[PDB]
Amino acid sequence: CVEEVTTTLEETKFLTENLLLYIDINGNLHPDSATLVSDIDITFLKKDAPYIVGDVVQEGVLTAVVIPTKKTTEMLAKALRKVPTDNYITTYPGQGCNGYTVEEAKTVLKKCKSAFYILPSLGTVSWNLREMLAHAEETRKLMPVCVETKAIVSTIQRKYKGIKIQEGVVDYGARFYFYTSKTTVASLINTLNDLNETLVTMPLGYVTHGLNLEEAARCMRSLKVPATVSVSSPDAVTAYNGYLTS
């Protein structure tokens, strides 16, 4: 019913051409699905938004289902039951920001309406901004920075006289990825995954995108690069790690 394959997307197409993607209420692709869509028009995903959980859109080789965020496992199962019975290449549903575990996803796919081929898929610290900047500078790790956070921008401008801060990668003094809250956490995670650099970072989405620390920890599971994650205090180190022990 569910088979974990050892192959890349292209190397799995011999089994089936059909891909099952996960989207949110607005038709935005989950980070795990966002990389499976190259050279395909995806206008249809957002064209009919907003959706409700369980809605399914299809075009060509692609099927996409709107999935929930865990509070429930029953709601994730109910959403997957709407996918037409077929054979699909996919990823485990509900990972990353949505908050489900791999075992929860397996439980849901165990119900076996369709057949699924599942593609294959650093210490936490409490460092202040001065410490993070110094660490980035010497290690050459990429440091995401929200440019709306003026206190950070001001610090960077004082440390690296002459830096011209703008959105995107800026490599001046240290290597920064400057972003704003006006793009999604998913898009930021996908960009950082594509850059394929080790990070030194605060939890992504925390505060800037309205996420609490647990929600941000869930999203951080979608990173496919190593990351030194720096949290607000020693007590937050324990909390954050606990969110990941789950």
- Name the DSSP letter for residue 28: P
Cβ(203)–Cβ(229) below 8 Å: yes
Cβ(88)–Cβ(78) below 8 Å: no
Return the biggest CA–CA distance within the chain. 60
- Domain locations in the chain? 2-118, 129-245
- Which two tokens mark 52? 């409700």
Burial of 208 (0-12, 13-18, 19+ CB in 10 A): buried
Domains 2-118 and 129-245 share a fold: yes
Q: In CATH, which superfamily holds the domain spanning 2-118?
A: Nsp3, SUD-N subdomain (3.40.220.30)
Cβ(36)–Cβ(13) below 8 Å: no
Cβ(228)–Cβ(199) below 8 Å: yes
- Name the DSSP letter for residue 132: H
Burial of 181 (0-12, 13-18, 19+ CB in 10 A): middle
Cβ(135)–Cβ(200) below 8 Å: yes
CB atoms within 10 A of CB 231: 22
CATH number of this structure's domain 129-245? 3.40.220.20
d(CA 119, CA 122): 24
Q: What is the resolution of the experimental data for this entry, in Å?
A: 1.4
- Closest by CA to 42, choosing from 58, 20, 66, 24, is 58
